[PDB]
Amino acid sequence: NPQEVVLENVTENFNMWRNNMVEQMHEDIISLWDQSLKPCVKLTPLCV
Amino acid sequence: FYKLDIVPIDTNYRLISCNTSVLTQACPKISFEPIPIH
Amino acid sequence: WVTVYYGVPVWKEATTTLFCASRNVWATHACVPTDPNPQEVVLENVTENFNMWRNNMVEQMHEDIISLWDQSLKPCVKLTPLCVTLNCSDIKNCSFNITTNIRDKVQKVYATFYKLDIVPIDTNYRLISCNTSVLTQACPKISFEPIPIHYCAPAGFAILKCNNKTFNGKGPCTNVSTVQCTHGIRPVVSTQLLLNGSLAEEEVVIRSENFTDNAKTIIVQLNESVEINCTRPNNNTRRSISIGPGRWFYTTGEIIGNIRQAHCNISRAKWNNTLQQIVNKLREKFENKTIVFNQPSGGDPEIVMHSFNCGGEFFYCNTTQLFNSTWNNTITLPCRIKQIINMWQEVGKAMYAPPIKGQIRCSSNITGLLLTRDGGKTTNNTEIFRPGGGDMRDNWRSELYKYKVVKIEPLGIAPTKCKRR
Amino acid sequence: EIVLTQSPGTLSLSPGETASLSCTAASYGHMTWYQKKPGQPPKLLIFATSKRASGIPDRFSGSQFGKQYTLTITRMEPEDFARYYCQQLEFFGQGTRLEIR
Amino acid sequence: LGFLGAAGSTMGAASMALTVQARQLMLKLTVWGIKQLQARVLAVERYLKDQQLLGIWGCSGKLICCTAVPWNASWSNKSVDEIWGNMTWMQWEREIDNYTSLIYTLIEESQNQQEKNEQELLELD
Amino acid sequence: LGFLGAAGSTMGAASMALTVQARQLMLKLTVWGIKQLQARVLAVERYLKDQQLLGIWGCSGKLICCTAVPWNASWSNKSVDEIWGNMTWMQWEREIDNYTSLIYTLIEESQNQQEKNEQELLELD
Amino acid sequence: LGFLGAAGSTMGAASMALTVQARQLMLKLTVWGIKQLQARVLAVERYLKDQQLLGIWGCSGKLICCTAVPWNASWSNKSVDEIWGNMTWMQWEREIDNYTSLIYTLIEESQNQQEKNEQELLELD
Amino acid sequence: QLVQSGSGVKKPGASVRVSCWTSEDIFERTELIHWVRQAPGQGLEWIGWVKTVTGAVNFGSPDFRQRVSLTRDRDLFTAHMDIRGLTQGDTATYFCARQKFYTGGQGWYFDLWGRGTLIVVSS
Ligand SMILES: *[C@@H]1O[C@H](CO)[C@@H](O[C@@H]2O[C@H](CO)[C@@H](O[C@@H]3O[C@H](CO[C@H]4O[C@H](CO)[C@@H](O)[C@H](O)[C@@H]4O)[C@@H](O)[C@H](O[C@H]4O[C@H](CO)[C@@H](O)[C@H](O)[C@@H]4O[C@H]4O[C@H](CO)[C@@H](O)[C@H](O)[C@@H]4O)[C@@H]3O)[C@H](O)[C@H]2NC(C)=O)[C@H](O)[C@H]1NC(C)=O
Ligand SMILES: *[C@@H]1O[C@H](CO)[C@@H](O[C@@H]2O[C@H](CO)[C@@H](O[C@@H]3O[C@H](CO[C@H]4O[C@H](CO)[C@@H](O)[C@H](O[C@H]5O[C@H](CO)[C@@H](O)[C@H](O)[C@@H]5O)[C@@H]4O)[C@@H](O)[C@H](O[C@H]4O[C@H](CO)[C@@H](O)[C@H](O)[C@@H]4O)[C@@H]3O)[C@H](O)[C@H]2NC(C)=O)[C@H](O)[C@H]1NC(C)=O
Ligand SMILES: *[C@@H]1O[C@H](CO)[C@@H](O[C@@H]2O[C@H](CO)[C@@H](O[C@@H]3O[C@H](CO[C@H]4O[C@H](CO)[C@@H](O)[C@H](O)[C@@H]4O)[C@@H](O)[C@H](O[C@H]4O[C@H](CO)[C@@H](O)[C@H](O)[C@@H]4O)[C@@H]3O)[C@H](O)[C@H]2NC(C)=O)[C@H](O)[C@H]1NC(C)=O
Ligand SMILES: *[C@@H]1O[C@H](CO)[C@@H](O[C@@H]2O[C@H](CO)[C@@H](O)[C@H](O)[C@H]2NC(C)=O)[C@H](O)[C@H]1NC(C)=O
Ligand SMILES: *[C@@H]1O[C@H](CO)[C@@H](O[C@@H]2O[C@H](CO)[C@@H](O)[C@H](O)[C@H]2NC(C)=O)[C@H](O)[C@H]1NC(C)=O
Ligand SMILES: *[C@@H]1O[C@H](CO)[C@@H](O[C@@H]2O[C@H](CO)[C@@H](O)[C@H](O)[C@H]2NC(C)=O)[C@H](O)[C@H]1NC(C)=O
Ligand SMILES: *[C@@H]1O[C@H](CO)[C@@H](O)[C@H](O)[C@H]1NC(C)=O
Ligand SMILES: *[C@@H]1O[C@H](CO)[C@@H](O)[C@H](O)[C@H]1NC(C)=O
Ligand SMILES: *[C@@H]1O[C@H](CO)[C@@H](O)[C@H](O)[C@H]1NC(C)=O
Ligand SMILES: *[C@@H]1O[C@H](CO)[C@@H](O)[C@H](O)[C@H]1NC(C)=O
Ligand SMILES: *[C@@H]1O[C@H](CO)[C@@H](O)[C@H](O)[C@H]1NC(C)=O
Ligand SMILES: *[C@@H]1O[C@H](CO)[C@@H](O)[C@H](O)[C@H]1NC(C)=O
Ligand SMILES: *[C@@H]1O[C@H](CO)[C@@H](O)[C@H](O)[C@H]1NC(C)=O
Ligand SMILES: *[C@@H]1O[C@H](CO)[C@@H](O)[C@H](O)[C@H]1NC(C)=O
Ligand SMILES: *[C@@H]1O[C@H](CO)[C@@H](O)[C@H](O)[C@H]1NC(C)=O
Ligand SMILES: *[C@@H]1O[C@H](CO)[C@@H](O)[C@H](O)[C@H]1NC(C)=O
């Protein structure tokens, strides 16, 4: 479960366009996508 | 094949992904349904 | 009575996995603990026993380099489709029948090969690496330029360095400094002559595991560098032959200009001065006599020729003009170029070096030599030395000769007259 | 050559006795010893002056005396009446032989 | 003295530098990444073995931890002044080969009895 | 007793062996190498969770750490002699299911108040 | 207060929650497995660096560890009541940029001298 | 162990190719392959060596350096001795032997010897 701890009188600077979490999500998804296809059938024989 | 997947060679066709990339078939057992992660 | 102290300056000889600090073939983006500054802690009255020929750091450097080299080529283009009969005329311009992107058509294509890369079949040629190994083309984006790396001990370990200067590579050293990381060492690949790395502080020092055993390599570390100008003058062009679905073979296309021999230029006076110092030290190590330098007798390239990795091309140089001399204005050394390289004496693997489009010019520093003795009974008062050995661990052994790895054991017991309340 | 002179040339011994084989060097590297029979390749007995090769019994031993190195074969068996040679790196001595008294 | 301060030559010469030494104790499947991960794990595992051991001898201090254990043999038959003077810590350790793993003559037993005794007194007084 | 000394049967029967147990707490991508690395990391992570927890209850000793926390319910309605006698440590633990994560009835609060009180007295006296 | 209790605004407002925060400090070569192993190692390595550092300042307590080090410059020229009141812990830290790595004005030297002095007194008295 | 080429007779001026070979397990643990000669009625004479890794060679005297080519084959786990210019003085049994990796100062010692190839040079 989430803890949601609200911080009284706390301000912070957010920037969605400099968010390292976005870059990691992109990297995780592509490496997973490729890892999952690693053992799958190659279709080289169809380039005829 | 759907038309978008093939290109004329110049009724003579080739798969579009024969000169730029290596084509791999996704395994039929792999679901592509998004499951949220945290 | 029994009192325990923690953090005492005590160490034991030990091995441990080392990590380094500092697109390249040796990665270097992963080796990024980033070097701050050396600490050079000099230990008063501390002596230690060093042995460059039993140095585990050498074995690790060799293992790291080969595993990196292979890892970097793992995703690169295989050249299996080129092991077909080639129709070769005149360096040779060869043609062959290769399956194209659509695997029901065959193209006739052309590429050059250097003579050293092909063997007659019995104008019918095959690549030399078609019966002993699997040939892989190195990716054009991978730099082979040596970038120095520093070997660093894990936190519970330290590296002791010998500062004796004229240390012979084996035995007690009485001036010991403690560092966490070694000096940077460029992983230079070469034979016969040692290139770049680091020079001796005062004198040329000749080291050998045993000077009377002619099976061991004599390593000569110079105290002055000799600069070598190596050129591959031909004005090339690069050609790309598709060999598959997103894969292609990079080869050399038509030569734009005239054909000229690759060569290296060494100053004659500098080389003569270098040899005089070597001769003086050999005279001291053996027993007076005269010194004769001569040509290696192994016959074949790779064994008898000097090799360089220059811009990514592989040069084999006929260094006989450097050694055909008896001791009591430039020298031009012709060089040959080879594209199929068995770097490291591996079995089952080979690399194809893609050609470089432009003219290549390198400037390297000779900082040492690998010499062997001519055995047998001496029939005069002379000894004969030849370029030799060729075991790559000798190159790394020379750079790492100053270091030993030890384990810190900070906990210990000493006497007093104390008892807990 | 002045290196690896061996002696005695021929040693007439009874079974069960001890052979004493000497090799004198002009220099000090460790000595190596071999046993040979006609029609056979030599067998390594001793190396690094005093160590013995696997398969070699404790009859065989050796030691250093400055530039003199020696091989001792004690409790000699009939199978040891063979030709012996000393080696020092690249050189071999003349060799000596044991014979039955 | 710097990182080690080795061979201060009076044993205690570098005792005040004991903490200098004590203090010294992205990447996928690439060669350097794997080696760094193992090195990091090793540093931690070793650090903890030393702290764990001090922790059962009743030691948490660093420079000196006095115990309640006597010498039951000479071990090295020298007076304190012959050790803590004209000597490198390493030489001192070098002198004792046979009272190494055996130096710890149940230090931990003495520690356990002391903790037990303290509990009994706290319950009783 | 050996490594566990289990079922010494008086609870405290093996209390002096608590440290025997406490003390017990190349390779690439080969199967055995990977498994060993994970096992080493797990041992460390678990060791530290226990030390971390003792560390906030004011415990650093090992055999016995007396606290300032009373029993606010019977929990297990037995006298001390009925527990510390005719019983295996495991049986004792087996008896309490409902005062497990709830046994730690803010031990750490008592510890925090004590540390705060000590600081106030040091500043004031 | 919950996990952080940030901005309690009197500095010591959340001092009694310091331990709430302190406490918070199969799989092969699959992407998630590798990342989790590195994360676990990092948590351990960082935890230990903080404990190691407290350990040489003579600190093992958590809420407050009084030292023997004076202020040798104003650093931040405010009285105690101007800091411990009308202020978030982060603001307090934000105020000092130049007495950060330099705040530790040889705390460890003071600790070493104290341990040495204790040993000398135990041997002498 | 160390399988060798058989014996034979050559006329003066002829060349001979002597070879030997072994298993992968032995070859991979060998630093040097040495060749030793024994003329009838004589003791042992060292001819030379080949490093199994680099192909580097050395010889007993110029009389061999200028006539005998020593090579190795790291894919086949073999070694060869090509003797050119055979004379009557070269009649001998030729042995191959191996030197295991060893540290300096231990001296040379060969644990394993082949059976010996007999080469006779005669009119
Ligand atoms: C993968 O593919 C490679 C490439 O083909 C292959 O390597 C080759 O192996 C063959 C042996 O099978 C090598 O062929 C020999 O070459 C020597 C060369 O000598 C000259 O060149 C050297 C260069 O260093 C000079 O130093 C030297 O002075 C010479 O100028 C030849 O001398 C050999 O000739 C004999 O063997 C031949 C076998 O076919 C015979 O045909 C020939 O007549 C000779 O022997 C016969 O006559 C003798 C009398 O003259 C008699 O005494 C003998 O008993 C016999 O009857 C030979 O041609 C070739 O060079 C290697 N090539 C390269 C590029 O290295 C690998 O083996 C193969 N791999 C695997 C793993 O299976
Ligand atoms: C021993 O150590 C020495 C060094 O001390 C080694 O010698 C050096 O080797 C490297 C690799 O072979 C050489 O780098 C290459 O140089 C060529 C030629 O460069 C010239 O022509 C270029 C034309 O485009 C020009 O750009 C170059 O300009 C340089 O200088 C300006 C400043 O004036 C700077 O702004 C530039 O960025 C350049 O640095 C110069 O006029 C070049 O063509 C090569 O480029 C290829 O590789 C790079 C990646 O490395 C890639 O990005 C490119 O696209 C291209 O594919 C490359 O830069 C270096 O010049 C040598 N140093 C000297 C003094 O000669 C020696 O090899 C070591 N020996 C051994 C045995 O290891
Ligand atoms: C290549 O490898 C070889 C080994 O294969 C090395 O050779 C050794 O080198 C050392 C150093 O020169 C030699 O050491 C000398 O040993 C002598 C032994 O003889 C005495 O002891 C034996 C006991 O076995 C008795 O039987 C004998 O009768 C003698 O009593 C010593 O006498 C020598 O002493 C001299 O030096 C000492 C200092 O150490 C002085 O105090 C003495 O007064 C005297 O001057 C000396 O110790 C050793 O013998 C050599 N061979 C062997 C087989 O060990 C090569 O050195 C190495 N090459 C290189 C370049 O490193
Ligand atoms: C032992 O090694 C030290 C370290 O190199 C030598 O002292 C000086 O060290 C500094 C680095 O801290 C260098 O910049 C100096 O150049 C070194 N001095 C000299 C003269 O080179 C020390 O001299 C060495 N001891 C001996 C006997 O040579
Ligand atoms: C090898 O020789 C052939 C001719 O036998 C060369 O073919 C020429 O290629 C160029 C393009 O680079 C064409 O414009 C010419 O028309 C071709 N000539 C002929 C007669 O067809 C080939 O380029 C040569 N290869 C190399 C690397 O030099
Ligand atoms: C290096 O160059 C020398 C020439 O300077 C080559 O030696 C010649 O080799 C041929 C063929 O065997 C002989 O006919 C000549 O008489 C030799 N010349 C001299 C002056 O001796 C040598 O072969 C070359 N080496 C390499 C590896 O290319
Ligand atoms: C090589 O090409 C020429 C034509 O240029 C042809 O006549 C010859 O037969 C070919 N040789 C081979 C081996 O294919
Ligand atoms: C290429 O294929 C043709 C047949 O289409 C054949 O005549 C020719 O000899 C082949 N060339 C080579 C080099 O194999
Ligand atoms: C290095 O050792 C030699 C003895 O082998 C000694 O003469 C020389 O002075 C030493 N060098 C230094 C810097 O101490
Ligand atoms: C070669 O030596 C000169 C000094 O003679 C130095 O300035 C230069 O940087 C050195 N080059 C290399 C690659 O070490
Ligand atoms: C070597 O010197 C010659 C002149 O003697 C010159 O023509 C040539 O370009 C030089 N080569 C190199 C690599 O410097
Ligand atoms: C020929 O060499 C010059 C440099 O000397 C280079 O600028 C030119 O582009 C080369 N010619 C071709 C066609 O690449
Ligand atoms: C060796 O040479 C030196 C001069 O460098 C000389 O003093 C010494 O006597 C010579 N030794 C012999 C044995 O000739
Ligand atoms: C070696 O030098 C001599 C002169 O001393 C010369 O006659 C001979 O041709 C040279 N050999 C080579 C390979 O350069
Ligand atoms: C040729 O050698 C000189 C030194 O004699 C050096 O300054 C110059 O840079 C070298 N040429 C090249 C292309 O490196
Ligand atoms: C050795 O001396 C002889 C004369 O006895 C001479 O003919 C021969 O050339 C000399 N050898 C060398 C290498 O100087």
Rounded to whole angstroms, how far apart are CA atoms C62 and C18? 12
Sign of the torsion angle spanned by Cα atoms F73, F77, F81, F84: negative
What's the number of CA atoms in the CB half-sphere (13 Å) around residue F110?
Answer: 12
Residue C135 near residue C352, CB atoms below 8 Å: yes
Question: What is the whole-number distance in angstroms between the Cα of residue E64 and the centre of ligand 1?
Answer: 75
Residue written as tokens 């049967």?
F9
What's the number of CA atoms in the CB half-sphere (13 Å) around residue C253?
Answer: 10
Residue A47 near residue C105, CB atoms below 8 Å: no
Rounded to whole angstroms, how far apart are CA atoms D65 and D74? 19
- Out of C268, C317, C321, C330, give the residue to mutate to test ligand 11, the one with the largest number of ligand atoms within 8 Å of its CB: C330
Those residues with Cβ within 8 angstroms of residue G60's Cβ, 6 or more apart along the chain or in another chain: E60, F55, F60, G54
Amino acid at H50: V
* Inter-helix orientation angle G31-54/F31-54, to 10°: 40
| Structural tokens at position C227 | 């600069």
Rounded to whole angstroms, how far apart are CA atoms F84 and C379? 94
Rounded to whole angstroms, how far apart are CA atoms C409 and C7? 8
Neighbours of F4 (CB within 10 A): 13
- Out of C320, C323, C324, give the residue to mutate to test ligand 6, the one with the largest number of ligand atoms within 8 Å of its CB: C320
Those residues with Cβ within 8 angstroms of residue D70's Cβ, 6 or more apart along the chain or in another chain: D20, D21, D22, D23, D62, D63
* Inter-helix orientation angle G31-54/A20-37, to 10°: 140
Q: Answer whether the bond into residue C140 is a cis peptide, omega within 30°.
A: no
Those residues with Cβ within 8 angstroms of residue G57's Cβ, 6 or more apart along the chain or in another chain: G65, G67, G107, G108, G111
Main-chain dihedrals φ then ψ at residue C92, nearest 5 degrees: -120, 140
Main-chain dihedrals φ then ψ at residue F10, nearest 5 degrees: -125, 20
* Residue F39 β-bridge partners: none
Rounded to whole angstroms, how far apart are CA atoms C292 and C280? 12
Whichever domain contains H95, its CATH number is 2.60.40.10
CA separation (Å) from C235 to C259, C260, H58?
9, 10, 41
C vs E: CB pairs below 8 A: 164
Are the beta carbons of C102 and B9 separated by less than 8 Å?
yes
The CA angle G66-G69-G72, to the nearest 5 degrees, is 140
* Residue C96 β-bridge partners: C109
Could you please report the per-residue DSSP string of C184-247? PB-----BSEEESS---SSS-EEEES-TT-TTSPEEEEEEEEEEEEEEE-----EEEEEEETTE
* Residue D11 β-bridge partners: D98
The whole-angstrom distance between H71's CA and the closest CA on chain D is: 19
Where do runs of H (alpha helix) occur along chain F? Answer: 18-22, 31-54, 89-95, 107-124
| Structural tokens at position G57 | 């300042």
- Out of C231, C234, C235, give the residue to mutate to test ligand 12, the one with the largest number of ligand atoms within 8 Å of its CB: C235
| Structural tokens at position C205 | 């020092």
The neighbours of chain G, by the rule of 3 or more Cβ pairs under 8 Å, are A, C, E, F
Resolution attained, angstroms = 3.5
Q: Tell which atom from ligand 5 comes closest to the C-alpha of C111.
A: 27
Rounded to whole angstroms, how far apart are CA atoms E111 and E69? 10
Task: Name the nearest CA neighbour of H20 among H72, H56, H66, H60.
Answer: H72
Those residues with Cβ within 8 angstroms of residue C258's Cβ, 6 or more apart along the chain or in another chain: none
Amino acid at F9: S
Counting DSSP H helices and E strands in chain B, the numbers are 0, 2
Main-chain dihedrals φ then ψ at residue C172, nearest 5 degrees: -60, 145
Annotate C93-116 with b (16+ C-beta within 10 A) or e (fewer).
ebebebebbeeeeeeebebbbbeb
Domain count, chain H: 1
Rounded to whole angstroms, how far apart are CA atoms C344 and C66? 8
Residue D99 near residue D78, CB atoms below 8 Å: no
Amino acid at C419: K
Rounded to whole angstroms, how far apart are CA atoms C384 and C71? 42
Neighbours of C364 (CB within 10 A): 19
Sign of the torsion angle spanned by Cα atoms A41, A46, A47, B3: negative
Residue written as tokens 């990665």?
C27
Neighbours of C65 (CB within 10 A): 20
Residues of E in contact with G60 (CB under 8 A): 60
Residues of C in contact with E31 (CB under 8 A): 27, 30, 64, 67-68, 71
Q: Is C352 touching ligand 8 by the criterion CB < 6 Å?
A: no
CA torsion C67→C68→C69→C75, rounded to 10°?
100
Residue C94 near residue C87, CB atoms below 8 Å: yes
Amino acid at B13: Y
Residue C339 near residue C378, CB atoms below 8 Å: no
Amino acid at F79: S
Q: Is H105 touching ligand 3 by the criterion CB < 6 Å?
A: yes
Can you tell me whether residue C54 is helix, strand or coil? helix
Elucidation method: cryo-EM
Q: Is C380 touching ligand 16 by the criterion CB < 6 Å?
A: yes
Q: Look at strands H8-10 and C19-21 and give their pairing.
A: unpaired
Question: What is the whole-number distance in angstroms between the Cα of residue C249 and the centre of ligand 7?
Answer: 23
Question: What is the whole-number distance in angstroms between the Cα of residue C288 and the centre of ligand 13?
Answer: 6
What class does CATH assign to D5-100?
mainly beta
* Residue H94 β-bridge partners: H37, H117
Amino acid at C189: V
Task: Name the nearest CA neighbour of G73 among G102, G93, G111, G110.
Answer: G102
Rounded to whole angstroms, how far apart are CA atoms H53 and H31? 7
Could you please report the per-residue DSSP string of E68-125? SPPPSS-SS---GGGTSSSB-HHHHHHH-SSSSTTTSSSHHHHHHHHHHHHHHHHHH-
Q: Does E16 touch chain G (CB under 8 A)?
A: yes
Can you tell me whether residue H122 is helix, strand or coil? coil
Which residue's alpha carbon is nearest to atom 10 within ligand 16? Answer: C380
Those residues with Cβ within 8 angstroms of residue E25's Cβ, 6 or more apart along the chain or in another chain: C155, C156, C408, C410, E43, E46, E47, E50, G52
- For H87, the domain range is 3-121
Residue H103 near residue C53, CB atoms below 8 Å: yes
Q: Does H40 touch chain D (CB under 8 A)?
A: no
Question: What is the whole-number distance in angstroms between the Cα of residue D42 and the centre of ligand 1?
Answer: 31
Question: What is the whole-number distance in angstroms between the Cα of residue C85 and the centre of ligand 7?
Answer: 11
Q: Does B4 touch chain A (CB under 8 A)?
A: no
Residue C31 near residue C172, CB atoms below 8 Å: no
| Structural tokens at position D47 | 């190396």
Can you tell me whether residue G5 is helix, strand or coil? coil
Burial of residue E45 (number of CB atoms within 10 Å: 0-12, 13-18, 19+): middle
What's the number of CA atoms in the CB half-sphere (13 Å) around residue A39?
Answer: 4
* Inter-helix orientation angle E31-54/F31-54, to 10°: 40
Residue H36 near residue D95, CB atoms below 8 Å: no
Residue D11 near residue D23, CB atoms below 8 Å: no
Task: Name the nearest CA neighbour of C377 among D48, D4, H88, H86.
Answer: D4
Those residues with Cβ within 8 angstroms of residue C199's Cβ, 6 or more apart along the chain or in another chain: C221, C222, C223, C224, C225, C367
Rounded to whole angstroms, how far apart are CA atoms H45 and H60? 8
Neighbours of E12 (CB within 10 A): 18
Residues of A in contact with B30 (CB under 8 A): 36-37
Q: Is C121 touching ligand 4 by the criterion CB < 6 Å?
A: no
Amino acid at C227: E
Those residues with Cβ within 8 angstroms of residue C190's Cβ, 6 or more apart along the chain or in another chain: C306, C307, C308, C309, C395
* Residue C206 β-bridge partners: C220
Main-chain dihedrals φ then ψ at residue A21, nearest 5 degrees: -70, -25
Residues of A in contact with B26 (CB under 8 A): 37, 40
Could you please report the per-residue DSSP string of G10-68? BSGGGGGGHHHHHTT----SSHHHHHHHHHHHHHHHHHHHHHHHHTTTT---SS----S
Could you please report the per-residue DSSP string of D26-63? SS-PPPEEEEE-TTS--EEEEETTTEE-TT--TTEEEE
Neighbours of D37 (CB within 10 A): 12
CA separation (Å) from E98 to C7, C11, E75?
22, 18, 8
Q: Look at strands C382-387 and C2-6 and give their pairing.
A: unpaired
Question: What is the whole-number distance in angstroms between the Cα of residue C380 and the centre of ligand 16?
Answer: 6
Which stretches of chain H sit within 8 Å of chain C by CB? Answer: 31-32, 46, 48-49, 51, 53-62, 65, 69, 71, 74-75, 99, 103-105, 108
For residue B30, what is the nearest residue in chain A, using CA coordinates? A36
Those residues with Cβ within 8 angstroms of residue C20's Cβ, 6 or more apart along the chain or in another chain: C31, C33, C64, C149, C150, C151, C152, E32
Those residues with Cβ within 8 angstroms of residue F8's Cβ, 6 or more apart along the chain or in another chain: F1, F14, F17, F88, F89
Rounded to whole angstroms, how far apart are CA atoms G119 and C416? 10
The CA angle E19-E23-E27, to the nearest 5 degrees, is 170
Rounded to whole angstroms, how far apart are CA atoms A7 and A9? 6
| Structural tokens at position F87 | 């019983």
Burial of residue B8 (number of CB atoms within 10 Å: 0-12, 13-18, 19+): exposed
Rounded to whole angstroms, how far apart are CA atoms D48 and D55? 16
